[PDB]
Amino acid sequence: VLVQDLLHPTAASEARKHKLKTLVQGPRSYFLDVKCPGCLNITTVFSHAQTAVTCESCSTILCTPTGGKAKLSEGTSFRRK
Amino acid sequence: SINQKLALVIKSGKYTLGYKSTVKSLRQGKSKLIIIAANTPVLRKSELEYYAMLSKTKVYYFQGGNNELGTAVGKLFRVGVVSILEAGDSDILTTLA
Amino acid sequence: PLGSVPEGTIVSNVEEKPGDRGALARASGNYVIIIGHNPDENKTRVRLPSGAKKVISSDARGVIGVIAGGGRVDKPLLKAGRAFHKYRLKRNSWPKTRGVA
Amino acid sequence: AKRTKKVGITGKYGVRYGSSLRRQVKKLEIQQHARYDCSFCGKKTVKRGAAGIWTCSCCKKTVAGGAYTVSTAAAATVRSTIRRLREMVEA
Amino acid sequence: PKKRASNGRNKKGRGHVKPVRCVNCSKSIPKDKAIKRMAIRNIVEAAAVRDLSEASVYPEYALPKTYNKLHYCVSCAIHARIVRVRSREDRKNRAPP
Amino acid sequence: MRAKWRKKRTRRLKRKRRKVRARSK
Amino acid sequence: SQVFGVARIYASFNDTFVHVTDLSGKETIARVTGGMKVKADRDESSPYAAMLAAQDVAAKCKEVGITAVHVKIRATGGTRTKTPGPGGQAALRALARSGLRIGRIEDVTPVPSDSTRKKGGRRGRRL
Amino acid sequence: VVDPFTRKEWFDIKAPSTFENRNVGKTLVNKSTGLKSASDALKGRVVEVCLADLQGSEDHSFRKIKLRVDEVQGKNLLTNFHGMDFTTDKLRSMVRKWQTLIEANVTVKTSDDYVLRIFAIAFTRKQANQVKRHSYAQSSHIRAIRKVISEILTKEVQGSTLAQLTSKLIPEVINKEIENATKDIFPLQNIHVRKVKLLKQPKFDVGALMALHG
RNA sequence: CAAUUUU
RNA sequence: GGUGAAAUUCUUGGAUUUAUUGAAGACUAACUACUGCGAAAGCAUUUGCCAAGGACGUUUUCAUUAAUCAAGAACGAAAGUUAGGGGAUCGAAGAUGAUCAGAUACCGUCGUAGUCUUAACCAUAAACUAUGCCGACUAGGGAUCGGGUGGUGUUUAUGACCCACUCGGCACCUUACGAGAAAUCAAAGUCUUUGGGUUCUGGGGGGAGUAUGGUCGCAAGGCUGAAACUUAAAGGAAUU
Ligand SMILES: [Zn+2]
Ligand SMILES: [Zn+2]
Ligand SMILES: [Zn+2]
Numbered sequence A: 001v002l003v004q005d006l007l008h009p010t011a012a013s014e015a016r017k018h019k020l021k022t023l024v025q026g027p028r029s030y031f032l033d034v035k036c037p038g039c040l041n042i043t044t045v046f047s048h049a050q051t052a053v054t055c056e057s058c059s060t061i062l063c064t065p066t067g068g069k070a071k072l073s074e075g076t077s078f079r080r081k
Numbered sequence B: 001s002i003n004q005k006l007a008l009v010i011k012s013g014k015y016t017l018g019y020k021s022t023v024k025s026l027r028q029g030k031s032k033l034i035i036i037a038a039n040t041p042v043l044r045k046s047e048l049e050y051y052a053m054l055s056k057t058k059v060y061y062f063q064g065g066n067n068e069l070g071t072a073v074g075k076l077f078r079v080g081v082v083s084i085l086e087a088g089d090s091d092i093l094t095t096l097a
Numbered sequence C: 001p002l003g004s005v006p007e008g009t010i011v012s013n014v015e016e017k018p019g020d021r022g023a024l025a026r027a028s029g030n031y032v033i034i035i036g037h038n039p040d041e042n043k044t045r046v047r048l049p050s051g052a053k054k055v056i057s058s059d060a061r062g063v064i065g066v067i068a069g070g071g072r073v074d075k076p077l078l079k080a081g082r083a084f085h086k087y088r089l090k091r092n093s094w095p096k097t098r099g100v101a
Numbered sequence D: 001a002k003r004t005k006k007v008g009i010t011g012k013y014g015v016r017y018g019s020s021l022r023r024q025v026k027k028l029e030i031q032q033h034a035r036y037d038c039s040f041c042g043k044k045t046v047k048r049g050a051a052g053i054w055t056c057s058c059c060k061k062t063v064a065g066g067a068y069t070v071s072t073a074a075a076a077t078v079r080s081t082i083r084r085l086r087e088m089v090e091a
Numbered sequence E: 001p002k003k004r005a006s007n008g009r010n011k012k013g014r015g016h017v018k019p020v021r022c023v024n025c026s027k028s029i030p031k032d033k034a035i036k037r038m039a040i041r042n043i044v045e046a047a048a049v050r051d052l053s054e055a056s057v058y059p060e061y062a063l064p065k066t067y068n069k070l071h072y073c074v075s076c077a078i079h080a081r082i083v084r085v086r087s088r089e090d091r092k093n094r095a096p097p
Numbered sequence F: 001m002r003a004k005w006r007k008k009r010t011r012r013l014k015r016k017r018r019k020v021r022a023r024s025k
Numbered sequence G: 001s002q003v004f005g006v007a008r009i010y011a012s013f014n015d016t017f018v019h020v021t022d023l024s025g026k027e028t029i030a031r032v033t034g035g036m037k038v039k040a041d042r043d044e045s046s047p048y049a050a051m052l053a054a055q056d057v058a059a060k061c062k063e064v065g066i067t068a069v070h071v072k073i074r075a076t077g078g079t080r081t082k083t084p085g086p087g088g089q090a091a092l093r094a095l096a097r098s099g100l101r102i103g104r105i106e107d108v109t110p111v112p113s114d115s116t117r118k119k120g121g122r123r124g125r126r127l
Numbered sequence H: 001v002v003d004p005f006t007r008k009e010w011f012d013i014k015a016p017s018t019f020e021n022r023n024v025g026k027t028l029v030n031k032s033t034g035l036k037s038a039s040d041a042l043k044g045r046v047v048e049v050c051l052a053d054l055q056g057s058e059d060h061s062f063r064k065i066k067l068r069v070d071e072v073q074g075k076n077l078l079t080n081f082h083g084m085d086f087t088t089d090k091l092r093s094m095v096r097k098w099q100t101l102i103e104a105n106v107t108v109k110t111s112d113d114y115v116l117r118i119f120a121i122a123f124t125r126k127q128a129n130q131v132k133r134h135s136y137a138q139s140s141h142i143r144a145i146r147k148v149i150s151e152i153l154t155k156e157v158q159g160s161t162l163a164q165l166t167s168k169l170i171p172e173v174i175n176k177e178i179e180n181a182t183k184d185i186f187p188l189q190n191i192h193v194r195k196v197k198l199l200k201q202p203k204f205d206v207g208a209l210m211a212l213h214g
Numbered sequence I: 001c002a003a004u005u006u007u
Numbered sequence J: 001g002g003u004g005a006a007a008u009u010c011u012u013g014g015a016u017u018u019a020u021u022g023a024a025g026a027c028u029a030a031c032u033a034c035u036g037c038g039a040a041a042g043c044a045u046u047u048g049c050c051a052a053g054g055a056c057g058u059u060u061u062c063a064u065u066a067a068u069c070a071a072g073a074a075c076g077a078a079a080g081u082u083a084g085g086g087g088a089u090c091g092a093a094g095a096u097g098a099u100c101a102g103a104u105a106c107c108g109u110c111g112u113a114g115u116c117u118u119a120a121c122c123a124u125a126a127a128c129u130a131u132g133c134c135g136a137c138u139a140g141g142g143a144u145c146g147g148g149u150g151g152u153g154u155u156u157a158u159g160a161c162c163c164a165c166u167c168g169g170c171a172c173c174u175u176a177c178g179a180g181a182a183a184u185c186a187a188a189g190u191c192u193u194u195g196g197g198u199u200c201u202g203g204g205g206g207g208a209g210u211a212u213g214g215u216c217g218c219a220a221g222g223c224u225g226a227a228a229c230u231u232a233a234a235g236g237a238a239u240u
Helices: B003-010 B049-055 B068-072 C081-087 D022-033 D080-086 E074-080 F007-011 F014-020 G047-051 G055-061 G089-096 H142-149 H162-169
Strands: A031-034 A043-046 B015-017 B032-036 B059-061 B081-084 C010-012 C032-038 C043-048 D044-048 D053-055 E019-021 E028-030 E035-037 E070-072 G009-011 G016-021 G028-033 G072-074 H046-049 H065-072 H077-084 H106-108 H116-118 H196-198
Touching: B003 B068, E035 E074, E070 E074, F007 F014, G009 G089, G016 G047, G016 G055, G028 G055, G047 G089, G055 G089, H077 H162
Parallel strands: B032 B059, G009 G072
Antiparallel strands: A031 A043, B015 B081, B032 B081, C010 C032, C032 C043, D044 D053, E019 E028, E035 E070, G009 G016, G016 G028, H046 H065, H065 H077, H077 H196, H106 H116, H116 H196
16 A cells, blocks of 8 residues: 555456456456266366356266356366366 | 147147047057146036047146147137147147157 | 034024914025024024024024025115105105105 | 226216215225126126026036125135135045 | 433334233233333242142152243333433443443 | 414314305305 | 142233142132222222232142142233232232142233234323 | 032043053042933043153153043043144244244144144254354245155155154154254254144044053 | 323 | 222123034234335235246347436235125224213223225325435445355254355444544445536425316325415534
């Protein structure tokens, strides 16, 4: 306060200000490279959820929708996408 | 309930309204789950249930009124009896069984 | 019969004594409660639509439900005409002149 | 147009019988002339013929109901206040 | 002037709450408003409870307790409930003593 | 007095005057 | 190994009212008021008028068989003061001395699920 | 005048048999001479009695009972059960502030031909390590645990004629399983039932009563 | 418990 | 009973109290909070249906569609009106015992209209947070409701709770930074260093929300609304 730097902020301070009240606007979601244990290929899934995603052969579950981010529900895979 | 579930059928699956095109469509067994209103008269309700007893088809006693069922199938209109004769993209077969 | 009905109900067209064939609360839109019931001393206690208490026999029958046609008297007779015509099927009781005349 | 503003059905009496006594008919006179939702055939064709009778036009079943309307305020709380009471002789 | 910060009692962002009834003066007051007083420990007290156990069979081990939850008004709280100090800085305390 | 019981004296003198204006037309 | 009773001690303000009933709850034995004893009309709510009122209820109970009681205090009840008046604590000790036996003091004051407005009005009784 | 406390005479009270000793009360009615022979003409009284004397374990001090006279045999009798209720001080002691009271009102028609209206109470406790003194519910946990506390007392049907209900309400085995059905939300509080009042006495039950004798 | 006036 | 004290008022025909069944209408306890929803009224028994909404999330879409609004409308506690159902409890008028020098008041026992519910009306109140609506800045704190993120957390495999956040909501303390006549205020600040946008209202007190005209109402009345004339004080906030 009374003198600061607004151009080299604390890089660990985006927990401390909102996703939409920071200097350069930036989202916080990402993408989930998930896989079904019954099947062979990879798909990407938004980290938050909406309509429930599918698979090619045993098209049951890769993520579930709720009020926050999704849940994969069988431990498979996430690098980053 | 099932007011949303009829609406899933009428845009997608073949169905016949009324009373005479659900008795003609029942002499081959080609109709499934005749939905019946409540105050439809017991002269015909107790003996199209009797046809359903021989055709081995389900009956749902839709406990809404007579003119209530016309709104449920969307019609600007007063229906009494529907007859879903195919359910090609539906889920009504086992959830009312 | 009143011995066959649970108390607190709304009986109608009750008799006064069994076999008398209709006695009590027959007019347009009136009805009787049964207040209590006495198994010793075979008897029921109704209250008839005057609001007076009454003990009567527990085999006096009665149909259940207010007699249809309730609420005639909201409508004013509104003229001499349809006051003449409600009486001239019943009896000569009209027009009554005042005794001071 | 609106041929009369506030008198409604009871403009056939003209200038007589009063003000607060005609409108005591007017909130009743329309109630006996209307069409009621016939709960048996399923249509709106209930009309009176007398003090109490309410015939239907299709399937012709006469509900012996209220004197001026179909069901009274009394009979509103009568078939309910034995439906309250009919289960007591059962359970 | 305006002598109370919360001018009404505990009625902020709500509007008009409910009435509830007093004890002695028997008048209605808003439920959030006036007075709630409870401080009791045991009520059947030393009028020989020590000589009530030998005035009893099955010496009963509890000597049971009553509970009420009463609401005074304010104009009987001044006549009954001891206040003893209300200056213009001790309108702000929050303690039971 | 209050401001409620001259607000009662005025609206119940007005019933006296709006009928004496209908006696003399 | 002795006979129980039921006391039903009523104690409003402006009167105290002590008796004893049977253990079946129906047969009533010797109702005693405060207003019968004194002739002052204000001592109906006095402790000392309620003191010996348990004695004439005790020797009435001890001469008919009754030895022990299941005593129950009772306030005004309903929508009234709901606390006992003056003569409550003056009376329960007053029969404890008299060769009686006590088990399971209760309280039988019924409070409502709040309803049915009481007296005074809206602005209530004025001092 | 004629002192009517001396032509009555003393009588006994006996209780049913899913209990220990049944020397419960000692009443007195009249002498049953004609002009109102009071032999089978008392017939309608009830007895409000505690559970300390009746089970011996005085730590069931509250949860009172009411017991109802049916018929008489020779200055003795046998009675039948008439609903378990709580007391006007525990349920006034129990409701502390900063918590939430729940309820469950399920009119259960029995296996036999009664109906009885069991109730229930509940509160929520400080799951300690607390810092938050309110300890409320979401008020959709109130709706949630009511959907199972109004169902776990509906396996009363298919069995448990009221003596077996008395063998199920007295040992508090039904207060156990609320903890073992609210592990969804909430392990433990003093989950009681507080009342059961019955409405539909069918008969006299001539041959279903005197088997409860000893 | 009840209390009126002081040009 | 009944109050300070008593008296009207029921009662040995059985009152008061006691237990048992019942009815009927009214209300929703204790839980209940410096807490929730609603546009303001208002809103606390569950259960089921009907539609609707606030917040929080999203790397979904549309591209300025927006703020406040003359005219005109929707909703609008209590009392009141019409016509019915019901009128248990309380209870304007009314009777009637106290009280008084005076009491058709306070105090006391009863009691009508009403309190409730249907179909319409009425459209005002301390409808108060007496301190418009939208937009942005300016000190710190601590606690709570709802939503979301991370903890190598505790407890019983989620759930509940603990810890650090952050969005929105009801508020609360501290200090005067600022402001004001002062009370006090994180808005009543960013104003004589005078301008973000935009509705409504006021000009000394009375006369007076009256008269008159219009207009709505079934009516009580509501909205619009003056003046002749008469006075130097009404008035606010704190000190003795
Ligand atoms: Zn799949
Ligand atoms: Zn018809
Ligand atoms: Zn008050």
